[model samples]
Target: HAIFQKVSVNGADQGSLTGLRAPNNNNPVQNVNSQDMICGQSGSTSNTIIEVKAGDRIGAWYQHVIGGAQFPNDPDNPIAKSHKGPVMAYLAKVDNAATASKTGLKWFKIWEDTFNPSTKTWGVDNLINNNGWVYFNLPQCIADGNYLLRVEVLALQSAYSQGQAQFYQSCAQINVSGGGSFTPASTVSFPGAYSASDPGILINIYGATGQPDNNGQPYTAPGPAPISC
Candidate 1:
């Protein structure tokens, strides 16, 4: 089992995010079906959001441990071998951050782990390259509002099954200041946005296939292309 220890913003730990955790009934060993995972929903902690200014150069830090061993920046950890897969980040403007998890809010993909031919896959090893923290920028042209930042990791170790991909995801609540004309389009819902058969969600990275930035094969991030702002 695995547990989410903490998450950070811009390199600083946001301890208030204690309520955020992948839905495993608080057990790290639990891996929900790929199509059933959502942020803080289904009896999971409904955490409050941390506030931030718009267009912040935010970097989210995640601390996850398996078998009592904490993750390291090294990309060669054998423990992480089966956990290899793509990481994704998203944003959704909401009326309130507290109940935003269960509230049907349209989420927009903001960022995701990219494909690299050098590795032949996007997995936990790629994530550890930056100590489990991936960086993305809030569009400078984004409108000011309250929003939720969603982050997720796709574990393909068990991709042999159609819905076996493990999803590790959480949300951060933030209040944005500063306004712009840019608005995110192509909005999609969580439970409704992803499908077990979607090319990216249901894929075998160990072989060759065309599924977005998969290059020659061995990788494909599910869902829509990330929004540019």
Candidate 2:
């Protein structure tokens, strides 16, 4: 299990988990259609909203538990090394990010990182290597407004079977300024975006050939392609 404990902008920590939806527990949401897929299990909205400019470097920090470790010296500080999979980020425009409804919000993918066959590394590997922080640029062309920034990490260590994949995610309230008016023409719903049978979701990362080669296969992350301006 892993918890998204805080947010960072341009390599600087935001305050004590400020603007992040609080998760009830450090657990994974296994069911794609479950309402919990919208956020973490029973996530509560936060009163604070982090302000940022367009094109800024923004990201989330993960840990095994709330306020666990700021540094990644602990072997399991963010997640176990065996928890291999992809990392993704999404944004949904809202009238008020601080009090936005978790359900029914149209979300557009902003960034995603999948397994690199060349490096034989998963997105989680890069995250762990970066001291539990994964960063993405805020699209400079999106319309300026309040939005919910969602970051998710999918762990495929036990994903060979249906319902075994682990999805750990959290949402941060944000207000973006100095942006263009390019709105995503297409968006996806949270519970409706993923399928239990998506190839990227139900996978055997240990390489069915009885080796640790990941079958030397390329992985495409599930969900719509990330938006571009």
Best by TM-score: 2
Q: Residues 107-131, candidate 2, lDDT per residue (tens digit)?
A: 9999988888978888999889987
The runs of at least 3 residues in candidate 2 whose Cα sits more than 4 Å from the true structure, single-residue gaps closed, are 69-74, 208-213
Query: Global CA lDDT of candidate 1, please?
Result: 0.60
lDDT of 1 by residue, 175-223 (tens): 7777577777678877677767766666655644433334455455777
| Sequence-dependent TM-score of model 1 | 0.77
Per-candidate TM-scores read: 0.77, 0.94
